[PDB]
Amino acid sequence: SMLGRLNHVAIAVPDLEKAAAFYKNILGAQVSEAVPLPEHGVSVVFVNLGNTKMELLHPLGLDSPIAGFLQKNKAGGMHHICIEVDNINAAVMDLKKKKIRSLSEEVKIGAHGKPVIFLHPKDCGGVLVELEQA
Amino acid sequence: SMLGRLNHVAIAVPDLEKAAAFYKNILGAQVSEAVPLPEHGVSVVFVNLGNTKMELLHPLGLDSPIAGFLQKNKAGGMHHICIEVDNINAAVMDLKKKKIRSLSEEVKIGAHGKPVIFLHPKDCGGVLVELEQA
Numbered sequence: 001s002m003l004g005r006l007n008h009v010a011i012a013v014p015d016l017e018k019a020a021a022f023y024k025n026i027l028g029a030q031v032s033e034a035v036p037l038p039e040h041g042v043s044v045v046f047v048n049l050g051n052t053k054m055e056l057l058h059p060l061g062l063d064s065p066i067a068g069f070l071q072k073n074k075a076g077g078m079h080h081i082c083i084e085v086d087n088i089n090a091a092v093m094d095l096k097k098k099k100i101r102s103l104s105e106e107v108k109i110g111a112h113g114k115p116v117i118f119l120h121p122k123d124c125g126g127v128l129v130e131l132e133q134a
Numbered sequence: 135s136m137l138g139r140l141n142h143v144a145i146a147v148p149d150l151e152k153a154a155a156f157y158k159n160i161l162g163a164q165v166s167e168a169v170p171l172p173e174h175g176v177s178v179v180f181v182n183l184g185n186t187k188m189e190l191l192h193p194l195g196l197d198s199p200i201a202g203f204l205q206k207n208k209a210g211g212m213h214h215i216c217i218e219v220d221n222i223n224a225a226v227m228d229l230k231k232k233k234i235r236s237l238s239e240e241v242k243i244g245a246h247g248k249p250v251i252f253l254h255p256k257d258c259g260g261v262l263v264e265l266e267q268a
């Protein structure tokens with residue numbers, strides 16, 4: 001099938017250090033060191049749950065894509081899910097053909113250095129969905 | 135005691151049939167029939183992504199535990215993540231000993247027929263977390 005695995009659940013957090021330490025030292029998760037991603041305006045910590053990852057995100061620089069989310073959601077919150085696709089270009093053409101209003105039109109290189117597209121919550125799906133080339 | 139896999143990401147949706155059909159017929163996901171869970175005050179559709187599932191949730195009756203979420207988030211939204219643990223009782227005692235204010239006291243039987251506990255976003259972790267016995 002075109003649609004694949006859940007690659008990550010992304011959580012925006014107001015304190016990346018504290019969030020990472022909670023998963024690591026309270027819950028006993030496998031947690032990475034923080035990685036700055038300046039191109040993407042965030043810092044990330046990866047929580048490896050074995051089957052998938054949680055990405056803990058915090059703004060990096062004054063123009064972060066998640067800065068506005070953290071003003072609304074001061075305690076942090078679930079920000080998006082990311083599901084893999086076998087072929088992102090075939091997937092974009094298909095979704096364009098289906099004429100869905102949530103499609104974000106332009107394929108960009110995402111935080112993993114692979115092409116992605118975002119579907120906003122505009123067709124009953126209920127969540128921001130990042131689709132990433134597998 | 136030891137933390138395990140992500141069992142599900144739960145999404146609250148204002149229209150369960152519309153959300154299910156989006157995943158199935160727009161994204162090409164494997165999607166269950168809607169299952170009412172009256173004891174838990176919701177109806178669920180399971181989206182099987184192979185590595186984990188999405189549980190799409192809609193209120194069933196008046197005092198649904200997600201009814202209040204759906205008033206705040208009219209388009210619906212990510213409601214919780216569920217992570218497995220090998221021993222729910224051990225985890226509850228460990229968490230009670232760590233004195234974390236996110237801990238929700240009562241072990242209940244969840245929709246999967248397994249004991250669960252919830253931790254709220256009160257300790258820098260960013261999301262509602264359900265822990266469920268493996």
Ligand SMILES: [Co+2]
Nearest residue numbers: 010080082130
């Ligand atoms: Co992402």
Ligand SMILES: [Co+2]
Nearest residue numbers: 144214216264
């Ligand atoms: Co759940």
